[PDB]
Amino acid sequence: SVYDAAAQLTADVKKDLRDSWKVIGSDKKGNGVALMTTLFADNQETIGYFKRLGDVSQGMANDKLRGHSITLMYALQNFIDQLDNPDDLVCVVEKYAVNHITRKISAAEFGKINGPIKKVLASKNFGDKYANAWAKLVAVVQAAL
Amino acid sequence: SVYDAAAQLTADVKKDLRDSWKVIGSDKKGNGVALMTTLFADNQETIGYFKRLGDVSQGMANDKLRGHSITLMYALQNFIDQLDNPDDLVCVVEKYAVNHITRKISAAEFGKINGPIKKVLASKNFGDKYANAWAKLVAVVQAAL
Numbered sequence: 008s009v010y011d012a013a014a015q016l017t018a019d020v021k022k023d024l025r026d027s028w029k030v031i032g033s034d035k036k037g038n039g040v041a042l043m044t045t046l047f048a049d050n051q052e053t054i055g056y057f058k059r060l061g062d063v064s065q066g067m068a069n070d071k072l073r074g075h076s077i078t079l080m081y082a083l084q085n086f087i088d089q090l091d092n093p094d095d096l097v098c099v100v101e102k103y104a105v106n107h108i109t110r111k112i113s114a115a116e117f118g119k120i121n122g123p124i125k126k127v128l129a130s131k132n133f134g135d136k137y138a139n140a141w142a143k144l145v146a147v148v149q150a151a152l
Numbered sequence: 153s154v155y156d157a158a159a160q161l162t163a164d165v166k167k168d169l170r171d172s173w174k175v176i177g178s179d180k181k182g183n184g185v186a187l188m189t190t191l192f193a194d195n196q197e198t199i200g201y202f203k204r205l206g207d208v209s210q211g212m213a214n215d216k217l218r219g220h221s222i223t224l225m226y227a228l229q230n231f232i233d234q235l236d237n238p239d240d241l242v243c244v245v246e247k248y249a250v251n252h253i254t255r256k257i258s259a260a261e262f263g264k265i266n267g268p269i270k271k272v273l274a275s276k277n278f279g280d281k282y283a284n285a286w287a288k289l290v291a292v293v294q295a296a297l
């Protein structure tokens with residue numbers, strides 16, 4: 008359940024999420040597009056879902072991809088800001104979950120974002136410990152799909 | 153064009169937007185729900201558009217309305233953070249515009265949000281000058297509808 012998944016965000020996990028977000032959240036445009044391009048590059052089978060964005064290989068030059076990417080980073084900002092209150096975290100998670108359920112995105116496919124997050128964190132010198140923390144947060148969204 | 157509208161936002165207008173957002177954006181859950189409930193109170197004809205959120209008169213207790221309201225405040229956060237780069241502002245504005253075009257929300261209907269914004273600003277003592285600044289930002293989105 009979403010609530011049990013949310014319960015897994017312990018004190019250390021929340022700390023690791025905040026500390027790493029201070030760095031990756033400071034460049035939403037750059038890191039957001041990096042996240043998306045890495046997803047498309049490593050999981051080419053997911054590109055079909057993003058038909059509305061056009062030629063996603065254009066990266067930063069594609070305005071639709073840039074707009075989508077920046078907005079996605081604000082969803083993460085949203086999650087981080089709700090870590091203090093699990094009932095609020097759950098209602099925003101469920102809101103975004105619906106955006107993906109309507110696009111027929113399963114829990115398994117949503118989980119494909121973990122690879123890209125691990126790589127982006129790694130490029131900023133944040134290792135496995137941080138990648139695992141982020142996987143826990145992603146797991147909360149997965150529980151709602 | 154949307155770019156024209158964005159490019160018309162001046163230094164004094166941006167200053168007023170940021171100064172007022174420092175306050176209204178500090179309690180996203182509270183002011184977000186206040187915005188939505190005020191819209192429903194003053195413009196009852198819009199309630200039907202939000203059927204997905206369920207019984208909106210439940211206010212804060214309605215988890216779906218709460219999730220929506222908090223997320224709406226991050227859309228405004230997004231706009232405020234992109235004020236100095238018109239190209240970035242335009243791409244996020246067009247992204248959110250699509251969310252409304254798909255729901256058949258016209259430019260005139262979107263402008264109905266100005267009343268609620270004016271009232272919420274007034275609750276924190278931000279007057280007409282600030283309401284006009286916000287109407288200019290809303291007009292940027294209207295240029296995309």
Ligand code: HEM
Nearest residue numbers: 053056057059078079082083106110112116117119120251
């Ligand atoms: C960190 C994880 C992710 C977050 C926070 C996230 C967030 C978002 C947000 C905020 C939107 C815009 C919602 C809307 O306006 O309708 C979106 C759209 C979308 N997401 Fe995700 N997403 C994530 C991962 C994924 C993954 C892994 C997939 C695919 C396997 C996916 C597929 C989609 C699709 C298809 C859209 C619609 C794009 C469009 O046509 O505009 N998302 N996502």
Ligand code: HEM
Nearest residue numbers: 106198201202204223224227228251255257261262264265
């Ligand atoms: C300050 C202005 C506004 C902003 C920034 C804004 C932002 C948003 C956002 C971020 C969403 C979620 C998009 C999605 O996930 O699909 C949304 C949904 C929606 N908005 Fe707005 N909106 C604004 C004003 C309005 C107004 C005045 C109306 C028209 C009465 C409107 C009607 C809708 C509807 C019908 C939905 C879909 C709700 C649902 O079923 O989830 N919006 N808006």
